Design a protein around this nucleic acid. Structure first.
Ligand code: ZN
Ligand code: ZN
Ligand code: ZN
Lengths: 196, 194, 195
DNA sequence: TTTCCTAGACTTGCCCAATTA
DNA sequence: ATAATTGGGCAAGTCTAGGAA
């Protein structure tokens, strides 16, 4: 079938695992993750921290890349991108390309790719060790379009694929989580878990 | 211009074969002998077998192209719907406007005819391997038949064309195709129909 | 031409017109009525016309189409698109915006405008029927609804299809009525019923 | 001549639940 | 448990006949 980006979990030689903040579902939450759903709920354009767990430090030049792909097989060949309303928004942080759904916050070494071959979008940052006195590395992502954006994701489930790659682009590890960009993350999360 | 769906089992005796898929609900690809219709899912493998009576010369290429089955619509270049085209992906070769792609063939070529704008994918004709009887081409349909803005629910014909390095028609075949979710349930049904 | 003749003349080549076969469905964009010898269709869509012949007209031959009002009282007036529709429909670099009738799918179209009669025509080159075909097909588009106030204004038109030579001398001639509308099928179904 | 309707019955993707191995 | 595959069924969305202003 038409090839699509790989999404299988691979801890790699460095024991790469992804972590998240345990925020709860109170009404004030801006980003909340559900361990039972392996799903992150976040508000549009707000901070979404993502934790990198490693058992041994990766080599130097190590990069961390994120990519969104549709969860359903029937839509996997579709490149996740912002709806037209959104790409057209003046919400540029000056670094990200207007069509990318995923941005990286507060990292001037941030890099964006428009795959020449797959048309696929992604964001990379250099991998940093955990801030001394720290257990893991944190990355602040932002999702720039809502799940309900007709014309975009349109209510379809998206996965965020986090890849650990050497300076040459080789795969060192991969992990993933589903995401839902919506106005009320606490409410939505509670509910979807309410269903189980 | 415009292209024919006129069989030309030619001087080589060109014929197409299809696998025996089964009718589960949502089978990936399935062909209906009675209907002469392929029923597949978007982006899924659509195997099409090439059978000749005699090996064609070298330079021979295979071309695929779609057309609306219906009279009026035959003039409308068949292409991907706006949405899918906009959010298209690719494989380093396939252009975003093409509906039909060829899977696993690093020698594939994609054409948008300058004078018809008509789109097509052509691969070289490869004689079957020693001990084989036919040659398979795997195709993928990039939009469902019901893609509003595209297929808009209208029937298409895939027309395979054997041709020489020159572009001369050496042979011709066709099949209708229905890209849908659930090719299984839909072939049964459209059979039940008779 | 003040008002070109619309008389049928198969002439030396056995020139005939052919038409597709669809019923009165709403979903039927274009539809020909043999009884009414009228063709209904809807704005901007495909109008397939079958060019039958008994004798193969020589290379260079041409097929010109022209609309004329049907009523005598309207005959001398040129059929043109309304001013509205005229300020947009110009897509397909060959078709001038005023022309009501266009042909699609032919690199060689040639639009006319009698400099002395102001009538608008779409010319094409005669072409033999497809290898295993018994007729050549032309794809016509009617650029305005017969409704266009300011355009056809509810007035019936006739399309005269002529076979002519490189010089433009007439060879054969047919014609038929056209009704550009809103969901054509019914109109025929009905047009055929008062009958 | 268009424009509304009123539904009903399909068309058709995709949910969910059972079920495989 | 655990993923993949499947079949049941559904409901958003389509076009219908059809009468009406
Ligand atoms: Zn959006
Ligand atoms: Zn599509
Ligand atoms: Zn008009």
């Amino acid at each position: 079938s038409s090839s699509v980006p790989s999404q299988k979990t691979y801890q790699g030689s460095y024991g790469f695992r992804l972590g998240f903040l345990h925020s709860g579902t109170a009404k004030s939450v801006t980003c909340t993750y559900s361990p039972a759903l392996n799903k992150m709920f976040c508000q549009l354009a707000k901070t979404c921290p993502v934790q990198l767990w490693v058992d041994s430090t990766p080599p130097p030049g190590t990069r961390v890349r994120a990519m969104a792909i549709y969860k359903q097989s029937q839509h996997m060949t579709e490149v996740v991108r912002r709806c037209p309303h959104h790409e057209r928004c003046s919400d540029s942080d000056g670094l990200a390309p207007p069509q990318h759904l995923i941005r990286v916050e507060g990292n001037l070494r941030v890099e964006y790719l428009d795959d020449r071959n797959t048309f696929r979008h992604s964001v990379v940052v250099p991998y940093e060790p955990p801030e001394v006195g720290s257990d893991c590395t944190t990355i602040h992502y932002n999702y720039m379009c809502n799940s309900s954006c007709m014309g975009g994701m349109n209510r379809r489930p998206i996965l965020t694929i986090i890849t650990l790659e050497d300076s040459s682009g080789n795969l060192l590890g991969r992990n993933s989580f589903e995401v839902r960009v919506c106005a009320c993350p606490g409410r939505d999360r509670r509910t979807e878990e309410e269903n189980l």
